[PDB]
Structures are given as C-alpha cells and as structure tokens.
Amino acid sequence: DWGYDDKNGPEQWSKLYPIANGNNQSPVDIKTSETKHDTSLKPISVSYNPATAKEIINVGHSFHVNFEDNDNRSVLKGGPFSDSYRLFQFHFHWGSTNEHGSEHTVDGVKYSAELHVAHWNSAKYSSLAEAASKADGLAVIGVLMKVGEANPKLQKVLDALQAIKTKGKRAPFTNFDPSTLLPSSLDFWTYPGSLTHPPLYESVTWIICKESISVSSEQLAQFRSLLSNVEGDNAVPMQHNNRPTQPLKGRTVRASF
C-alpha cells in the first residue's frame, strides 16, 4: 500500500506506478515569468447545489468530502473547457509544519495547505470511474492556503472531523456548497497534469487560483490530528500528505489574467 512515509511515499510510488515519472505529472511549480496569457480562456463558472453534499470519510492518508454525482446539479464550466464537469469531491493537502504543505508552488513559494475541488467530464463519460483515466476526464480546482487568520468558511468541515478520527470512519455531510471556500477572484492558471497521488493518472486539467485563501495555525493542527490508523490501534497522526512538485517536461502553464 502507498502512503507518504519514507518507505511508501512519493519517491517510491514509481515502483508500482511508473506513470509517476511521466510527462504530465502534478503538482508543479508555477514560474510566473514563464506563464502564457491566453485571451481565449473564459472565466471559471461554478454552480454547486448544497443538496449534493453527501459524506465525509477518513481515507487513511487524508479525508474526503463526497458529493452526489448522478446529475448536473453541481457543475464547473468555462475556463479552458467546452464541456461541463460534474463536482464529485473536495479535500485538502497539508504538511508537517506551517512552512510547507501545499502541493503546487508559485515562484518557488510553498504555502501551508491546498484545497482541491474535483470534477469529472459528464459531457463525454458516464461515470467518475470511466472518466478518471481519460486525458480530458477530470478537472480539479486548486486553491493555495496561506497561514494567517482563521478561516470561518472551514467551520463545518473542521467540526466534522471529530466523528471520523480514524481510518475508515465516515459520516453524513450535507447541505454544503464548496464554492464558499473559493477565493473572491477566480483568476487562474491552467495546465495539463495528473492526480497527485496513486494511481497518478494523467487525466487532470488543473485550475490553480491566483488568490490564496487563509487558514490558521490551529485549523491546520486539526487536519494533522486526524489519525491514519484504524480504531484501537496505536494512534498515527496524519502529519502530511503533499507530493513534491514535478518537472514540467515542456508543458505550458497558461494564465487567464
């Protein structure tokens, strides 16, 4: 099984998942002197229905908030896309201390955490499982989280963690619109990339917001106090789950601004 420790972590993923050394891997460092402004990029449009929120799950290396994805109640449109993409999940990545924790970096700068809002191409495919391995199958919005003031918009998420403290626990998580977590401006960078952990499919069009959102040192501590072990075993806090940045291999990061 893969993870983030020294024996099963990102530097070893290539043994079971050779795509880890591929040409479209994520995350990346966005060098702003090398980005290309593309006037053809449209604004990002998100329209999410809070009734699609379903469940929060401790998946061992992280926690996931999942959404009902049987129809187009919650969709992402615009940006580089001609297809509509259906929301299915959001989750976070974080690091061992405040000085790192984001997955993407901007001009070498590491942030404290990163929010991922993930969608699948329902115009072309019939399910997440079909879409997840297709080059145009997934769209993920990344938001860099800068340590500073406590972010009240995270409250429902943080309040839910006490009920999913150990691996495999899950609980209803309803009536929540994750567009409330996005920054005020949706100016973005986009590039073709991958899932940031196994199976590492090169199926993701990334949308990285220029504006960060805030998170406090104590809110990050709540993430790190989640446990990767099953109930009854020795407690193993989820200290970190961010992958190092990967080579661009000639890809172009486009800017909407």
Q: Specify whether 61 is catalytic.
A: yes
22 vs 148, beta carbon nearer ligand O55:
22
Determine which residue in the list 58, 105, 196, 228 makes contact with ligand O55, applying CB under 6 A.
196
**Annotated binding-site residue? 196:** yes
> Is position 104 an interface residue for ligand O55 (rule: CB under 6 A)?
no
**Annotated binding-site residue? 197:** yes
Q: Looking only at residues 89 through 128 of this chain, which bind Zn ion when binding is defined by CB under 5 A?
A: 116
Query: Which of 231, 226, 221, 237 is CA-nearest to residue 58?
Result: 226
**Annotated binding-site residue? 37:** no
> Is position 221 an interface residue for ligand O55 (rule: CB under 6 A)?
no
> Is position 41 an interface residue for ligand O55 (rule: CB under 6 A)?
no
CA-CA-CA-CA torsion sign (123, 128, 129, 131):
positive
Residue 224 corresponds to which tokens in the numbers above? 């790190």
* In the complex, minimum distance from the CB of residue 232 to Zn ion, in angstroms, rounded to a whole number: 28
> Is position 116 an interface residue for ligand O55 (rule: CB under 6 A)?
yes
x/- string (CB under 6 A) for ligand O55, residues 149-188? ----------------------------------------
Q: Which residues are catalytic?
A: 61
Residues making contact with ligand O55 (CB under 6 A): 116, 118, 129, 132, 140, 195-197, 199, 204
